[PDB]
Write a protein that binds this ligand. Sequence first.
Ligand SMILES: *[C@H](C)[C@H]1/C(=C/c2[nH]c(/C=C3N=C(/C=C4\NC(=O)C(CC)=C4C)C(C)=C\3CCC(=O)O)c(CCC(=O)O)c2C)NC(=O)[C@@H]1C
Ligand SMILES: *[C@H](C)[C@H]1/C(=C/c2[nH]c(/C=C3N=C(/C=C4\NC(=O)C(CC)=C4C)C(C)=C\3CCC(=O)O)c(CCC(=O)O)c2C)NC(=O)[C@@H]1C
Ligand SMILES: *[C@H](C)[C@H]1/C(=C/c2[nH]c(/C=C3N=C(/C=C4\NC(=O)C(CC)=C4C)C(C)=C\3CCC(=O)O)c(CCC(=O)O)c2C)NC(=O)[C@@H]1C
Ligand SMILES: *[C@H](C)[C@H]1/C(=C/c2[nH]c(/C=C3N=C(/C=C4\NC(=O)C(CC)=C4C)C(C)=C\3CCC(=O)O)c(CCC(=O)O)c2C)NC(=O)[C@@H]1C
Ligand SMILES: *[C@H](C)[C@H]1/C(=C/c2[nH]c(/C=C3N=C(/C=C4\NC(=O)C(CC)=C4C)C(C)=C\3CCC(=O)O)c(CCC(=O)O)c2C)NC(=O)[C@@H]1C
Ligand SMILES: *[C@H](C)[C@H]1/C(=C/c2[nH]c(/C=C3N=C(/C=C4\NC(=O)C(CC)=C4C)C(C)=C\3CCC(=O)O)c(CCC(=O)O)c2C)NC(=O)[C@@H]1C
Ligand SMILES: *[C@H](C)[C@H]1/C(=C/c2[nH]c(/C=C3N=C(/C=C4\NC(=O)C(CC)=C4C)C(C)=C\3CCC(=O)O)c(CCC(=O)O)c2C)NC(=O)[C@@H]1C
Ligand SMILES: *[C@H](C)[C@H]1/C(=C/c2[nH]c(/C=C3N=C(/C=C4\NC(=O)C(CC)=C4C)C(C)=C\3CCC(=O)O)c(CCC(=O)O)c2C)NC(=O)[C@@H]1C
Ligand SMILES: *[C@H](C)[C@H]1/C(=C/c2[nH]c(/C=C3N=C(/C=C4\NC(=O)C(CC)=C4C)C(C)=C\3CCC(=O)O)c(CCC(=O)O)c2C)NC(=O)[C@@H]1C
Ligand SMILES: *[C@H](C)[C@H]1/C(=C/c2[nH]c(/C=C3N=C(/C=C4\NC(=O)C(CC)=C4C)C(C)=C\3CCC(=O)O)c(CCC(=O)O)c2C)NC(=O)[C@@H]1C
Ligand SMILES: *[C@H](C)[C@H]1/C(=C/c2[nH]c(/C=C3N=C(/C=C4\NC(=O)C(CC)=C4C)C(C)=C\3CCC(=O)O)c(CCC(=O)O)c2C)NC(=O)[C@@H]1C
Lengths: 172, 172, 172, 172, 213, 162, 162, 162
Amino acid sequence: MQDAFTKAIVAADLRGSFLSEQELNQLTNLVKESNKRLDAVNAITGNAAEIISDAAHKLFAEQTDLIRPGGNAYPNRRMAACLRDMEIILRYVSYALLAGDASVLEDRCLNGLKETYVALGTPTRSVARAVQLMKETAIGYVNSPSGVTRGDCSALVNEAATYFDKAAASIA
Amino acid sequence: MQDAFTKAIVAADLRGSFLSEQELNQLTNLVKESNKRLDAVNAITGNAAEIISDAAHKLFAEQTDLIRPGGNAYPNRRMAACLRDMEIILRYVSYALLAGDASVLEDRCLNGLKETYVALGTPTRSVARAVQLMKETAIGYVNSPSGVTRGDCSALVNEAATYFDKAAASIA
Amino acid sequence: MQDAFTKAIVAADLRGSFLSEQELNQLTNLVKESNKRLDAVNAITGNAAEIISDAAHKLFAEQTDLIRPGGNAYPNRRMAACLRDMEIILRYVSYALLAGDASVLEDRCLNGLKETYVALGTPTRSVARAVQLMKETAIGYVNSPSGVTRGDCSALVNEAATYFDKAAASIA
Amino acid sequence: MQDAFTKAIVAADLRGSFLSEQELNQLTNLVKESNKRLDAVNAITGNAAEIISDAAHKLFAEQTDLIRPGGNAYPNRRMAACLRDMEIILRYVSYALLAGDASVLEDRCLNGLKETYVALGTPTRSVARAVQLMKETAIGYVNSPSGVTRGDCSALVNEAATYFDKAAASIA
Amino acid sequence: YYSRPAPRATADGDAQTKLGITAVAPAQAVELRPNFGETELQAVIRATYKQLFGNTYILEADRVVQAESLLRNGSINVREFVRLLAKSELYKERFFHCTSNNRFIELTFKHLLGRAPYNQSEFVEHLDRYQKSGYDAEIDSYIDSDEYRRVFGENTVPYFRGFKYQTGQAAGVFERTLKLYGGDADSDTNRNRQGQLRQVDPQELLRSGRGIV
Amino acid sequence: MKTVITEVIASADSQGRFLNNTELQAANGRFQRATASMEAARALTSNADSLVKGAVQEVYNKFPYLTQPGQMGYGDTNQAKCARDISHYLRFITYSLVAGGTGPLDDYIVAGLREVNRTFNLSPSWYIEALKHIKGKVGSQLSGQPLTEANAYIDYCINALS
Amino acid sequence: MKTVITEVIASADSQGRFLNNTELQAANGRFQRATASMEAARALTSNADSLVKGAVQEVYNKFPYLTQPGQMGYGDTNQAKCARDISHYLRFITYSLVAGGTGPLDDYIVAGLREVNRTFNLSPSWYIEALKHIKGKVGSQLSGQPLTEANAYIDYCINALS
Amino acid sequence: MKTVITEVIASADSQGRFLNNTELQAANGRFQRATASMEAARALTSNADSLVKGAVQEVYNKFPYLTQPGQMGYGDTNQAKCARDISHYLRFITYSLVAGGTGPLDDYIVAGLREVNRTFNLSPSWYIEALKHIKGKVGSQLSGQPLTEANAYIDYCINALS
Ligand SMILES: *[C@H](C)[C@H]1/C(=C/c2[nH]c(/C=C3N=C(/C=C4\NC(=O)C(CC)=C4C)C(C)=C\3CCC(=O)O)c(CCC(=O)O)c2C)NC(=O)[C@@H]1C
Ligand SMILES: *[C@H](C)[C@H]1/C(=C/c2[nH]c(/C=C3N=C(/C=C4\NC(=O)C(CC)=C4C)C(C)=C\3CCC(=O)O)c(CCC(=O)O)c2C)NC(=O)[C@@H]1C
Ligand SMILES: *[C@H](C)[C@H]1/C(=C/c2[nH]c(/C=C3N=C(/C=C4\NC(=O)C(CC)=C4C)C(C)=C\3CCC(=O)O)c(CCC(=O)O)c2C)NC(=O)[C@@H]1C
Ligand SMILES: *[C@H](C)[C@H]1/C(=C/c2[nH]c(/C=C3N=C(/C=C4\NC(=O)C(CC)=C4C)C(C)=C\3CCC(=O)O)c(CCC(=O)O)c2C)NC(=O)[C@@H]1C
Ligand SMILES: *[C@H](C)[C@H]1/C(=C/c2[nH]c(/C=C3N=C(/C=C4\NC(=O)C(CC)=C4C)C(C)=C\3CCC(=O)O)c(CCC(=O)O)c2C)NC(=O)[C@@H]1C
Ligand SMILES: *[C@H](C)[C@H]1/C(=C/c2[nH]c(/C=C3N=C(/C=C4\NC(=O)C(CC)=C4C)C(C)=C\3CCC(=O)O)c(CCC(=O)O)c2C)NC(=O)[C@@H]1C
Ligand SMILES: *[C@H](C)[C@H]1/C(=C/c2[nH]c(/C=C3N=C(/C=C4\NC(=O)C(CC)=C4C)C(C)=C\3CCC(=O)O)c(CCC(=O)O)c2C)NC(=O)[C@@H]1C
Ligand SMILES: *[C@H](C)[C@H]1/C(=C/c2[nH]c(/C=C3N=C(/C=C4\NC(=O)C(CC)=C4C)C(C)=C\3CCC(=O)O)c(CCC(=O)O)c2C)NC(=O)[C@@H]1C
Ligand SMILES: *[C@H](C)[C@H]1/C(=C/c2[nH]c(/C=C3N=C(/C=C4\NC(=O)C(CC)=C4C)C(C)=C\3CCC(=O)O)c(CCC(=O)O)c2C)NC(=O)[C@@H]1C
Ligand SMILES: *[C@H](C)[C@H]1/C(=C/c2[nH]c(/C=C3N=C(/C=C4\NC(=O)C(CC)=C4C)C(C)=C\3CCC(=O)O)c(CCC(=O)O)c2C)NC(=O)[C@@H]1C
Ligand SMILES: *[C@H](C)[C@H]1/C(=C/c2[nH]c(/C=C3N=C(/C=C4\NC(=O)C(CC)=C4C)C(C)=C\3CCC(=O)O)c(CCC(=O)O)c2C)NC(=O)[C@@H]1C
């Protein structure tokens, strides 16, 4: 696998060089944010169940047909599959967020996902939608926590977004 | 898997509806024929060995080259395979006949058979031929038994045919 | 598998015939050379380690980049694989040499190799080069042994070459 | 598996009770020593290779028969095993040391070791000896480092000993 | 007349050698026996490593010494040795963490049973299994399953069952496994350009039945 | 989908053998029974609606608080759903009778039941009552084997739900 | 049992390798955290009882009907049980804080949670409230990291329950 | 590549679960340590060259005969290589410090070490000295935790080599 640190290393390796001082300063800074980074993750994990639950409700309010006979989220088993999937995607996203790198997400999760969905007949569009719905709810928590020292998390928040979006895009 | 009953169900499900009274009457009558249906199957199974034996003889009388050195049914090992295959196809056909549905046959047996045969270099045409030869012999028994109450089996006989033919076609 | 004898058989079989007297005399003669044949093989096996060691040194002196960061033979892990590949190829070649037939080599060793090399990004040309480097060194031993009865091994030597070359070609 | 913390928990559980304040104070202080604890482990791991190498030399100087034909450490194959084993035991000891509990070492390695050795005909006595030889060398490092903050490690040192000894005993 | 070179005049072997499946087709089976010579042990070990890891190259450091010792004492059977290898950092790093679960399932299917996946349902039972319980429970379900026990049940190294007719096979294994095997020098490799990707296309699965769930 | 017919085929298929007398005997069983099964289905199909109303209703009596504001039973949307759901159960039990196996029930309803219900906080209990109430009504319109069949399937769900 | 320390050992053991720097770094993390964790535990342990009373209570307010006769909340036995259970949850949470991993929680509470709850018809919802109410109280006695830790674990259960 | 962060993800991933408190604790450890690690790297990176010269040199003192004609230490090419190699080892050691795991070392240096060395008849011994000599020098420019870290990694190789 890969993450922010390892990555920079690898790059450096092919040049054949010690790490540039400039490059260290990326990592040095990254460290400093750690605490923020962590809490972000913690927030997702803490609220996981909910995040999904929520997103689902909204997804089905919008696309009523998914839950109608002939739709893709019917019958029960399909609905369960759909829920399961949403969760998974989330799980990965979180992982990435900690790593500070998309990779884990791309390789385990996104890679081949679209085509799977296609073969099954799952409407990729809707999947993507769900991912976004999730995104918003998730940010909601990341950004509004309780008992945490107040400061600016934007930087992290945006990176979070990006991950969600890579997801949305590749699925779609 | 699937069969006549299950199928009708599934259809009904996508409409989202209870079964039509009309539709019940398909199944109701299907039941009535059961006994006939069964005997048909029984006849095949009872004569299995023979059916094949016979068909083979005829197949090789026609296409002498198969059994000539360098042909596809030579040497022994190949010949064995060829016999084995015939049997299998038969077996499935029977299955279908009982189910009252092609599916089982199409999915496990036929689907991708052609491609296999291609890759191996086995001549699909001959295979198809064999299937027909089988067909005729089989019907022979279905249609001319002993100790059964005399009546009309045509309906079943034709359906039998169709199964054989789907086979012939998809292989060919 | 296959080898010189078996092969001739197979040919004969497709004609459908007993072996030609002429054809026997090919095999009869082939037998006579056995002893030479054997010693040839023995020479390779005896010197194996070195053959490779040698070839490698030369390979890396020539293609400096392979061992540079970013090249294919760097780092250790990769280097190890490359040595190992060389051994495997050699091993097979020897096998062939004994069999008196390319087949074994083509099927087990060369078959699929190109595509692998492609996917990995390994530069096929260099691989081929290595194979040759090996060839020359190997012949070196085959052709200059000690304590063997003096005579002419050319016939064998050339066949050896061919094997190496089939290798070079199919890889390249 | 188990360790100091987990253990205390489990005990508490069967009483059905919250942890006694007294009991917390065991763990509280255990924490405080952590840093020392860690360095201890680090010292072993850092010197591993050596520890063994050393012990072996001494073992074989003493029990010359092991390495003579008919002995248990002869021939090469066996010798290799014997070295491997020593190492393993070491590894486990270290593990324990970190955990702050014997459990892991006994369950993973010691439980059944004696009997194995017996069945093979390995002289358990000698094995035990080796373990001690190791012990002494190991302590040597744990207790005499450079560039670590100077202080008292005794407490840890003794616990280390005990682990080694449990090993020695159960094997013997 | 009844003896004459047929006009096709393909050999017996021909059909296999043209595909490159000549070694795997009726593959040889390696069994460990009640008391084993030093060579039988080392054959079995080589065969396992080659089959589980998919002819990918295992260095001298990658080997797992303990599992091999236990296999030497007699304290674990070959079936247990297989589980230990399968449940291992090295396996997980090659065929699990870099690929997608769809890709992994088809790999493990091939590694632990020489066939490819028979139909789409096989992906459902193994993907849900993985979310419900670990990787580990999933891997077990393979070795634990009756098909693993029925063939190569104990003390036998797993061998490719693909490319030969097996009872209750689906059609279109043959072709599917040809996508997975791809020749004696090919090997599935975490570390090739464009990463680790499924060969089996998802539309051919549905071509074999697809029930609800 | 699990029906008598599919199963024997499956079993036959696995062993790699022709359908012999053993399996046909079994099949025969399914067909003989059908007449009763079919009858039961016609009866449920007809009274569907009425059964549904009665059930939904029941549930509310049984669990008054559901109809209070801020609860699940409250506000028409939910009531509509609640109706729908029970109708889905009703249509599928009928399917099973006709198919001559639990099959239809299993994959459509039983599969994933738990997790669905967990994630949306549907309490199994409710459904159960619905069913029970139904069972009671059915216990009038039907009789003899037809009845027996209806029960079997209805119960099968109770057990799955609980 | 999963704690930081046990895991790294496990991982080291599986590979068959000595504990190297990688793992120690991890360990260091745990034990550094402990100081906060430990504090939290002392706080919960002390107020245990009071938290429990408050919780049990809450549940009843939230679900009045439980206290009615013929229900689960009704009659002392049940109340006793209800108390017991909530206390058990708290005890595991305290244990986990000290152990420095979810381990204790997973093995006692979580594994088999569903089926237990199903067979005895315990509604997850209830427990949850209990927890939430707790969380709220804890949100006074604690602060900063100590608090954060307490939450994490409390939540972990909420998620498992739901 | 094995770093603290990658591992916990991996472990989380295997079990199929979200990162819970357990793993974060571990992560935290990695991050707090980094400050020391990073420092050490800056120090090695700067003095690289000087360390290398000194090492190469040392080796020759230790094994005079290498510099004699017909040996491996002899003729500039070889000396150049010898330099290169040690420099490569140093670069990986710096990489590891920063990555916070042995990962980089394992994959570049260690894996395949043996066979390479065997086939080219590089004697581990040599490398070792190089390292040791280095370790000694580093034992001046650094101090406290920064030092400790540097050692760990340097050693890790010694052990792998031997
Ligand atoms: C929910 C938002 C939508 C939905 C999903 C859905 N998915 C399937 C089936 C599968 N989905 C996957 C997903 C993955 N494979 C992976 O490896 C990963 C990452 C690890 C993911 C996320 C796979 C493997 C399958 C096939 C196996 C299975 O059936 O579970 C279905 C069922 C399709 C069917 O007809 O069987 C569905 C419904 N569908 C919707 O309608 C939502 C928009
Ligand atoms: C960001 C989304 C929101 C936010 C975060 C935030 N956190 C801190 C500081 C800390 N947070 C933690 C958290 C952790 N460190 C760990 O080791 C773990 C796992 C065991 C966690 C959960 C810690 C320890 C700190 C430092 C001490 C403290 O609590 O102050 C800050 C302050 C910045 C800084 O750390 O330098 C912030 C901003 N708070 C917000 O306002 C965002 C909504
Ligand atoms: C006989 C009528 C004709 C014939 C048959 C033939 N088949 C093979 C080899 C194979 N046949 C199969 C086929 C199947 N696999 C399946 O899954 C099914 C049912 C779904 C079948 C029917 C397979 C897999 C093989 C290859 C492996 C094996 O031997 O089991 C041969 C031999 C060719 C070869 O080189 O293997 C032959 C001859 N060909 C004829 O000449 C007849 C017209
Ligand atoms: C059709 C190809 C042939 C034929 C069939 C035929 N059968 C019946 C009646 C019955 N056949 C059976 C057979 C079975 N029932 C079972 O349960 C089983 C499995 C153990 C079998 C094998 C039975 C019991 C009956 C009923 C009694 C009877 O023997 O008649 C008929 C009569 C019409 C009907 O609908 O039952 C017929 C016509 N007759 C033909 O023309 C072919 C020879
Ligand atoms: C060395 C002369 C050149 C070189 C070779 C090279 N090969 C690999 C990697 C692989 N090579 C093979 C090939 C085989 N597997 C077999 O069984 C056989 C014989 C039947 C061969 C020849 C395979 C399968 C691999 C993958 C191994 C694995 O995944 O562990 C490499 C390494 C590339 C990589 O990134 O792994 C190299 C370097 N390449 C050169 O640069 C030399 C000129
Ligand atoms: C050819 C590359 C070089 C060469 C070979 C050569 N060998 C012989 C004769 C023999 N060599 C062997 C060797 C073996 N026979 C075996 O059974 C085995 C395996 C156990 C070996 C290794 C034997 C037995 C003979 C016969 C007696 C002998 O060695 O003299 C010849 C003589 C020709 C002949 O035997 O017909 C030759 C020429 N000699 C060279 O100089 C070539 C470079
Ligand atoms: C060395 C100090 C002494 C010695 C050792 C020795 N051991 C064996 C054989 C085995 N060693 C073990 C031990 C283990 N395997 C494990 O997995 C574990 C951890 C649970 C241990 C500690 C086992 C079980 C074997 C057999 C398996 C194998 O060979 O790998 C031998 C060889 C004897 C034989 O016939 O196998 C030896 C020499 N004996 C001495 O002479 C030393 C005093
Ligand atoms: C004991 C066997 C010998 C010894 C140990 C010792 N260590 C310290 C202090 C520290 N040791 C460490 C080491 C680590 N902390 C970690 O997180 C890790 C893994 C990444 C290690 C290896 C640390 C950080 C400290 C704190 C202060 C420092 O700068 O070292 C002491 C002092 C007492 C204390 O616990 O702080 C001692 C005594 N030193 C000896 O002389 C013993 C022979
Ligand atoms: C009736 C006893 C209670 C009630 C029901 C109710 N149901 C939902 C939501 C769903 N209902 C189902 C059930 C099914 N859908 C299926 O596909 C099948 C299998 C064929 C069944 C059994 C489903 C899946 C949902 C969830 C998603 C959806 O909207 O369909 C609700 C809404 C709850 C919510 O939105 O969170 C309700 C209220 N209503 C009542 O009054 C009773 C308490
Ligand atoms: C409290 C919110 C409600 C309540 C609960 C209640 N629980 C039971 C029975 C059980 N509860 C549990 C729970 C646990 N037992 C354990 O060992 C653990 C893990 C440490 C837990 C969480 C169990 C297992 C039971 C089953 C039998 C038993 O008593 O142990 C009941 C009795 C229900 C019955 O019919 O068995 C009740 C009522 N009590 C209330 O008043 C609230 C509604
Ligand atoms: C230095 C102590 C001694 C010395 C060294 C020396 N090395 C080689 C050849 C090689 N050295 C390496 C080492 C590495 N290259 C890598 O990519 C890695 C991993 C990052 C390492 C550790 C390698 C792989 C080679 C072989 C290929 C090559 O030419 O680079 C030699 C030459 C040996 C030969 O046979 O050509 C020498 C001499 N020289 C001295 O003076 C010391 C004795």
